Structures are given as structure tokens and as C-alpha cells.
Write a protein that binds this ligand. Structure first.
Ligand SMILES: Nc1ncnc2c1ncn2[C@@H]1O[C@H](CSCC[C@H](N)C(=O)O)[C@@H](O)[C@H]1O
Ligand SMILES: Nc1ncnc2c1ncn2[C@@H]1O[C@H](CSCC[C@H](N)C(=O)O)[C@@H](O)[C@H]1O
Ligand SMILES: O=P(O)(O)OC[C@H]1O[C@@H](n2ccnc2)[C@H](O)[C@@H]1O
Ligand SMILES: O=P(O)(O)OC[C@H]1O[C@@H](n2ccnc2)[C@H](O)[C@@H]1O
Ligand code: SF4
Ligand code: SF4
Ligand SMILES: [Cl-]
Ligand SMILES: [Cl-]
Ligand SMILES: [Zn+2]
Ligand SMILES: [Zn+2]
Lengths: 519, 512
């Protein structure tokens, strides 16, 4: 058991000048529980109304040893007292019950609680919310809601540490990660995840087969259902909100990967496949799917059905292996719904832009509109070091088509373990992709953000412009590289055009002239 | 002086494909870049915009087009544009050079140029130019904007930035200087640029009258055109579509007129209640352009500067007029492209392409992004890469880059590189989406290197080799790690491609 030397992340005020953390109090009628739903408020100058935005940053300045407040405790205890055969949001929704989690999400999304219940009940949205993750501020994932972003963190045998991964969780959520996954493959996996869960206000996912492999000393041939099952229960008891499980990597699909350029690039999927060939046996997660469901519906662990046969190169995009798995993902989805287990489906991968629409169309149909969860896609293989940009293109496009959760890709993809700077870069790039998708879907009020920043830009309220942005101190420091003076924060120009050539200032002149003399 | 070609692209060599222009016997040396790989893999040949290396800026590049131009002059001709020659059935040195660079038929190039669907920006005074073509049927091209302002930068910094931009893949540049020494700065750039150089003549015209738009007139504008055309400027952005009657259509806009040239014209028009003097003198402008072969980039002075303003009346009014000006320009054999948006949300991008294709008779489209959202100043190379890739996939021929300093200040050399890398990504992603021939060969080569753990090959094949390598080396710096079947992301036990090796080894022996 390590004694990590934790470093506090920069403060909320440092990251978001002129912002405050706020909460909307709403009362859950059936229980009388009071919910405090987070949002962030940007205070503007010149008498503009304050701008309210989503807030994933969670409780601030909490000592890691103490952990976040357990805000969901009285919800869980009351539902436990009332007695129930299943504990998932889907079960409650199908009973016609609007839970605290549903009301919370509804408020957070500014939609009707009954609409939220309906979407969860039909399986088109999920609320990943293990009853052991009491610290969680509930959120919803689904095509009819804001496009969400996941940040992957975790150590490897080669790099990082508990204190660095706890920093990265707090940092990822500060910049807007809606979920995280702890993908640790090194030492102290159980400990690392514990620290993260007790200090994360967003859902935390894992890939259980990683730790299962770590337990059998990295020898895949020594995996079996017993060790996998033990791992599922361990992680469920900690509070993991969703599991990526590669139960679609069937024995008969593995030969389909033989002629691929980059083979099987899924970590989990390659592990399952190796085990399958070694024994010529069927995927033990597939074989024990029912047993897995019986675990998940007692804790409410959502299942993220993995795509072990996702393409790892443009060359392999939309090939037979990938779509063979997708078909099976749909089967597993329907089976999970029978047991009231919440499901999302994992998708590609490396996919050129003209092949992206086929991916969405097939998933929507074959998986009956379960939420889709994509890694990018990366639209080209040529730019390692910049794969947050290559994949932002694909993420935005497939987001516009209905993808509900975008798994980020950092500048270090294909190169090494991301550090804290890489985590921020990835989150910012994917917040851009997710918001651009919200706009393309004409999601209600999404453009208000753009309009507020653009108004500040035209009116030369520079500090307002910075404060309204995704990353205020970056915008400001960039501006200030050439015009550092306080006075330049009210200039009707910047260094790009200078005072004589600033088009918005010239537009001010034009409108002044027209106001007096007409057009 | 900029980092060397070898420092930027390890294992790469600059090469040239030699071809002979039959009608003249002139020998053309068409550049390309070859990445030398390990393990017996064939070398990968890529496009190369970097131009002649290690030439001192005070000396300037060799004047490779001199004999081309001198001969065409001797032979006598009423017009000097690639469109005029193409329409005469002539395949010029520039067209053959382009065909060779694009790996396409010289006759196809001539056909595209003659119908106005592609342009070869190639002022006969820019003798240093290595010809390139802009058009939907060709590789998607990228433009880098550079230049000083009254507030920042200098002649040396801007000359650096032009060499730097082209090093990383800029296919054209524009010198948008609005500060001191505009004429001299542009001279240095033109003499040292192997790629087409564009300008916006109205900027220097305004500088000539000390920043007072009301003191502009046709005379000072025409003097500027002649001055810039004599230096060798390959294309002019001219906002002749900002008509007097369109200005009131911008009154309700959230961010008004964001075009620099556009706002200047609109101010002048309102001041005098007179029609745009570039519009009024369009015929005169064409009479200048077809003697130098200065291509015209018809500006979109009324582009949207916010998501709110996207695809509004003002924008489309100007687009209709751009089509008119395009057809008129073609009548005088002036090569034309049309400038486009702007700030446009993704669901509105398809309409932009559809309407430009129809209303402007398929002239090459030249977009600024577009930016798909306003929320992330500091990252507008990414917000706009999304838009650029998408509108490129629909047929946009030239993508004007957007740097991380957009809306914030004058980009520096780092920002220029970031801008070019982001846009080379967008351009290539568009090439793949268009299924442009051999486009995926690049991706396939790097991905093969990735799967076989030829790490140095992977780095060498990429858009920015040293960034890739330095990123990898942050956690695994030893030379030995360059042949490891893992990296620090997964480690030895969890690397999926190494596990795939194991899977295939097992199948090779025992079957599937
Ligand atoms: N510890 C960690 N921290 C952050 N991301 C991780 C991680 N472990 C795995 N990942 C993510 O999961 C991927 C698996 S390793 C290589 C996957 C491959 N590039 C592909 O296309 O799927 C990584 O590329 C990264 O996206
Ligand atoms: N000197 C220079 N160096 C690099 N880019 C320049 C430049 N001068 C102008 N530009 C480009 O031209 C633009 C004009 S100023 C503002 C334009 C506005 N943001 C819009 O959406 O169109 C700049 O934002 C930048 O993209
Ligand atoms: O084990 P594999 O590589 O499949 O999973 C790596 C990561 O990628 C995520 N992902 C998302 C879509 N496809 C894969 C997955 O949830 C996990 O975060
Ligand atoms: O004067 P304005 O702002 O129109 O032009 C600014 C820059 O933007 C470029 N551009 C490209 C498409 N629309 C505008 C134009 O060629 C020049 O590089
Ligand atoms: S000077 Fe140019 S870039 Fe700066 S605020 Fe004005 S219009 Fe925008
Ligand atoms: S360890 Fe993971 S990221 Fe690194 S080479 Fe192997 S598969 Fe790629
Ligand atoms: Cl990889
Ligand atoms: Cl601006
Ligand atoms: Zn990959
Ligand atoms: Zn702009």
C-alpha cells in the first residue's frame, strides 16, 4: 500500500477566470431528497447576462485521503430498504419510476424527467451509476442528449504513478471530461482505481480483462472464467460504473483478422483472441454472458460492449471482421436488455471520412439504437503526434450522425503513455468535436455558447471572450504574447491586423456612419 | 535560418523527376521527397513543397522558369495566361510540370485549366516558382498566410516563416502584410518562395493612403496592382463582390463584416454612396491580369465571422456576384478561384459547396476553414480542421489554414507550423474521402511500419518526424526501444500488436 505524494491541480479560479461553480437545487418528490445539480456560471462585463454552462469539474480542493462527499448514499439506502430484485436505472425506468439519478440528469440536460426515464427504459440512453460509487454526480449518455466525452487515464508497467493518475483524473474533469476510464496495466491496479473512484465525481469505467491478465502474471493462456469473475466482483464492489467487455470477439471471427494490415489493435480483444486460439475454445466472456449480466444488474454496472476487432489502420476500416463483431454486439445488447442491464456499444477506430456514415447506419440498426461509443475515429494514419486532430475530425463527424460518447485520443496515441498535458489537449480537442456535433444536431440552446463568445469578440470585451472559451488562460496568454498590457484588453484591435486594419472596428465605423446618414 | 531539411525529415532525400517539354525541348525537374525505409521495404515517394534548400535569402532562388517565359514572349501572343494557352490547345511547361507532380495526364491538366475547373497560379515575373495546380480533380492543396502588422514582426521573421511554412507542406502562401516595408518584405518572400505567392492588393493600397479608407480610389488601387504584378505576385484576392447594395444586409449580423479587405471596401462605398470600384473596374483589372497571368481569387468580403451569421443573405448575395465575376473573368482568359467561408456549423457546410459548385460554374473553391464552432479561441486550427476536412471531401480545392492564434494575435513561427500540420491532415483526410488515386499509399506505409515496430520508419514517414520521435522518447529514450515490440502506453505484456504477432505465430503452426 503506497503513500503517494499528491500534487493539487491548478484551482478552478486559475482555470476559469470570472467563473463560479453553481448548483440548481431540485427536490425528488417520491423521496423528498434534495438534489444539487452542478453548473458553471461565467460572469460577464458591460451588463451582459451571465452565461451558464455544463460543469464536470466536481467538488474542489478535496483532500485525496478524505475523498469526495458520498452524495448518493441516502438514495441508495432508501431504494435498498424498499426492496427490489434488480438495481439498475433501466429496471427502475421500466417500472415507471423516476429515480434521483434520472431527475438529476434531466435537470443537468434541461430536459423533462419523464423523457429521461423513457430514453433509459427503451435503452437509447444510459446513466452509468454503480450503487457503490456514492461520490458520483449523475450524467446521461445518449443520442438525444449532449454529446459526451470520455478521457482515458491509468498507468502502465513502464510509466506513471498513483499520484500522477489521481492528478490526471481531476485535471481531465476540470477541462470537461464527462467520464473517465482507468486503464491501468502496471502495479497497484486495485489501489490506483480506489483513489480514482473516491475522488471522481464523473462515471469511472474499466476493462476488467486487463487486471485479470495482470493477476495471472501477463500470461493469457492462464486466464479463465474464475479469475475474470473474481475481477468483475472486485471492481464492482469498488464502484466501477461501467465495464468494457470484449464478448464479441468470437473464436470463428479470429481468422478474419489474418490479412489485416495492423491486425488486432484492441488490447482486450487481442487478449481474448490469444486465449481462444490457445484452447480452440469459445470466448469465455461470451460463454458466460448471462452470468456477467446477473452480476451487473445487482450493482448497476453498465456494459460497454467492446469492439475487439476494430480497425487499427485506414486499410482495415469497415472490413469483414469489424462488422462480424458488430452483428454479435447487437445480439449481446438485446440479451443484456432482457436482464435490465444498461448497454452502450463500442465502435472504431481508424476510419476514413467516406466510410464513417456506414458505421453509424449499421450500428443504429443492428444494435437497436443503443448508445454508440467511438475511439475517434482517426481519419488518417499519417500524423502520429497529432492524433487528437486526425480523430477530432472523425469524432465530430460521427458525433453529428448520432454517436453519444466520444472516447478521446491524445497527442501521444501510438507513441506512449499520455501525461497531464496530453490529457488536457485530448479533452479540449474532444470538447470541440462534441460541441460541433451538438450544433450540427441543432441540440437545443447549443448555439447560445457560440453566440455569447462571438458577441464578446465583436464588442472587444476581450476578458469576457477569454472567460467564455473552452480554455480561457490559453486564449489570454496567446493574445498577450504580442499585446500584454492591461489596456490592450479593451483595444478595438489585436496584433493580427493592428488598429488601422481591424475589420470589426471598421464595421463599427460603418454602422456609426449608417446610424447617422443611413445606408 | 530555418532548421535543415535533414533535421525536419530524417531518412528523407529531396529528389527530382526529369521530363522534357517536347515543343520547347526544355528540361523540367519536378520535385518530390523520398523516405528511405529499413528492412528492405521500398522507399516511399511523397509530394514536396519545401523547394531548393540552403539557398541564402539575400541571394534568392534560381530563376528556373526564365527560358520558359522568354521563349513564349519571342513567339508573340495577345495574352499570357495558362487558360489562354490551354484554350489554344497548348500544353505549357507549367502544365506538364503539374501533370508530372500530380501523376496525371498532361492533356487532362490542360482540359481542366481550359474549362476553368483548375488553375496554375504562375505570374511570368515569378521565375523562382515550382508550378503547382489547384483544382477539385487534383490533390487538395493548403495555403499558409503570413505577413507583418503595424504591431508585430519584421522582414527577417516573415522570410523565415515562408521557408518554414513550405518546409511542412504549404502549397501556396499569401503575404498579408499591413505594416511597414510592405514592398520590400514581399520582394524578399517572392525571390525566396518556390510556391505561389498571393496578396490582397487593397491592403497596401490602404497603407499607401495612410490607413484612411476614404482616400482610396481606383487610381491608387491600379498603381498597387501593377506594382505587385511586376514583383511576381501569382494571385490577387479582390473583393469586387462587396456591392454597395449588400452592405445594409450586414446590419443585423452578430459579428458584422470580418473580412479585412471587405470591410475596407464597404467603408469606402458608404462614404461616397458609390459602387465598389473593383467591381466597376473589373474589366480593367482583367486587362492587367491576363498580361502577367495573375490569377484572381475573388474574395468573400461578406463571409460569416460567427456561427450565428452562417449562410445568411449577405453571404449568398456575394456568392451569386462571385459567379458573375468568374464568368466575366473567363471571357478574358483570367484564371479564377472563389473564396469561401468562414464560420460555418457542420450541418450547413454541404449547402456551401452545393451552391458554389452550381452558381460559380465549378471554379476552384478556396475556404478559410471553415470553423465549425466559435467556443475555442487558441484551438481554431482544430475547430477549423474539422470544417476544412469536410468541405475538402465535398470538393474544395484550396484550404486556407487557420493557426492557433486566430482571433488572438499575429501568428509566430510555431503557430505557422501548427497551422500547416493541421491543414495537411485535413487535406489528406479529404484526399482519402475522395478516393484520390494512391492517396492511401501513405497511410498504408506508415501503418505497416507501425505493425512491424519499425519505429524510426514510422517517425520518418509521418507529417512531423521529430515530434513523433520526441513524443515516443519522453518515456522510452534508449536506442534499443526503437526496435521494441511495445511502447510505454501498454508496456511489453499488453501491446496488442505484439499479441497479434503471437496469435499469428500460433496459427501459422497449429492453424485457426
Ligand atoms: N493507460 C492509458 N492511458 C490513456 N489511454 C490509454 C491507456 N491505455 C490504453 N489507452 C488507449 O487505448 C488504446 C490501446 S493501445 C493501441 C490501440 C490502437 N492505437 C487503436 O487504434 O486501437 C491507446 O491507443 C489509447 O487510446
Ligand atoms: N499577417 C497575417 N499573418 C497570418 N494570417 C493573417 C495575417 N493577416 C490576416 N491573416 C488571416 O486573415 C484573417 C483576417 S482578420 C479577422 C478575420 C476573421 N476572424 C474571420 O473569421 O475571417 C485573420 O484572422 C487570419 O486568418
Ligand atoms: O481494450 P481496448 O483497446 O479495446 O480498449 C481501449 C479503450 O478504448 C475504448 N474504446 C472506445 C471505443 N472503442 C474502444 C475502450 O472503452 C477503452 O477505453
Ligand atoms: O481580406 P480578407 O479577410 O478577406 O482575407 C484574409 C485572408 O483569408 C483568405 N481567405 C480564404 C478564403 N476566404 C478568405 C484570403 O485569401 C486571405 O488569406
Ligand atoms: S485585429 Fe483582426 S484578428 Fe484582431 S480583433 Fe480585429 S479583426 Fe480580429
Ligand atoms: S504498446 Fe499499445 S500503443 Fe504502444 S505500440 Fe503496442 S499497441 Fe501501440
Ligand atoms: Cl499503436
Ligand atoms: Cl477576430
Ligand atoms: Zn490506433
Ligand atoms: Zn473568425
Amino acid at each position: 500500500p503506497s503513500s503517494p505524494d499528491f500534487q493539487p491541480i491548478p484551482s478552478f479560479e486559475e482555470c476559469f477566470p470570472k467563473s463560479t461553480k453553481e448548483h440548481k437545487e431540485v427536490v425528488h418528490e417520491e423521496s423528498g431528497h434534495v438534489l444539487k445539480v452542478p453548473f458553471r456560471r461565467v460572469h460577464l462585463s458591460g451588463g451582459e447576462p451571465a452565461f451558464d454552462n455544463y460543469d464536470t469539474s466536481g467538488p474542489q480542493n478535496v483532500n485525496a485521503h478524505i475523498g469526495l462527499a458520498k452524495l448518493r448514499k441516502e438514495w441508495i439506502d432508501r431504494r435498498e430498504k424498499l426492496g427490489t430484485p434488480r438495481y439498475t436505472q433501466m429496471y427502475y425506468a421500466k417500472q415507471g419510476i423516476i429515480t434521483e439519478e434520472m431527475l438529476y440528469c434531466a435537470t443537468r440536460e434541461k430536459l423533462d424527467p419523464e423523457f429521461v426515464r423513457s430514453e433509459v427504459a427503451r435503452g437509447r440512453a444510459i446513466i452509468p451509476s454503480n450503487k457503490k460509487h456514492l461520490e458520483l454526480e449523475p450524467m446521461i449518455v445518449g443520442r438525444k442528449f449532449l454529446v459526451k466525452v470520455n478521457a482515458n487515464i491509468g498507468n502502465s508497467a513502464v510509466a506513471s504513478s498513483i499520484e500522477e493518475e489521481v492528478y490526471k483524473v481531476q485535471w481531465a474533469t476540470m477541462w470537461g471530461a464527462d467520464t473517465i476510464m482507468d486503464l491501468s496495466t502496471g502495479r497497484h491496479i486495485h489501489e490506483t482505481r480506489e483513489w480514482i473512484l473516491r475522488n471522481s465525481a464523473v462515471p469511472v469505467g474499466t476493462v476488467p480483462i486487463y487486471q485479470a491478465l495482470e493477476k495471472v502474471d501477463g500470461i493469457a493462456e492462464n486466464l479463465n472464467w474464475e479469475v475474470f469473475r473474481e475481477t468483475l466482483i472486485e471492481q464492482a464492489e469498488q464502484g466501477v460504473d461501467y465495464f468494457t467487455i470484449h464478448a464479441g470477439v468470437l473464436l470463428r471471427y479470429i481468422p478474419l483478422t489474418a490479412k489485416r494490415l495492423t491486425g488486432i489493435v484492441s488490447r482486450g480483444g487481442s487478449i481474448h483472441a490469444k486465449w481462444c486460439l490457445a484452447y480452440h475454445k469459445e470466448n469465455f466472456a461470451y460463454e458466460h454472458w448471462d452470468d456477467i449480466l446477473d452480476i451487473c444488474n445487482q450493482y448497476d454496472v453498465a456494459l460497454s460492449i467492446g469492439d475487439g476487432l476494430r480497425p487499427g489502420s485506414i486499410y482495415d476500416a469497415n472490413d469483414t471482421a469489424q462488422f462480424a463483431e458488430l452483428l454479435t454486439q447487437g445480439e449481446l445488447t438485446r440479451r443484456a436488455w432482457e436482464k435490465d442491464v444498461q448497454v452502450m456499444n463500442e465502435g472504431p477506430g481508424h476510419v476514413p471520412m467516406h466510410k464513417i456514415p456506414e458505421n453509424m447506419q449499421k450500428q443504429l440498426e443492428w444494435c437497436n439504437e443503443a448508445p454508440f461509443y467511438t475511439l475517434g475515429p482517426l481519419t488518417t494514419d499519417i500524423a502520429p503526434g497529432y492524433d487528437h486532430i486526425t480523430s477530432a475530425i472523425g469524432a465530430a463527424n460521427i458525433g453529428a450522425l448520432g454517436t453519444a460518447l466520444l472516447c478521446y485520443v491524445t497527442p501521444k496515441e501510438h507513441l506512449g503513455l499520455p501525461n497531464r498535458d496530453d490529457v488536457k489537449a485530448g479533452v479540449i480537442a474532444y470538447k470541440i468535436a462534441a460541441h460541433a456535433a451538438d450544433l450540427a444536431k441543432q441540440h437545443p440552446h447549443a448555439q447560445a455558447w457560440d453566440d455569447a463568445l462571438s458577441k464578446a469578440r465583436f464588442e472587444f470585451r476581450w476578458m469576457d471572450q477569454f472567460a467564455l472559451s473552452l480554455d480561457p488562460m490559453t486564449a489570454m496568454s496567446f493574445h498577450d504574447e504580442t499585446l500584454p498590457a492591461d489596456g490592450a484588453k479593451v483595444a478595438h484591435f489585436c496584433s493580427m491586423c493592428g488598429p488601422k486594419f481591424c475589420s470589426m472596428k471598421i464595421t463599427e465605423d460603418i454602422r456609426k456612419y449608417a446610424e447617422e446618414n443611413g445606408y
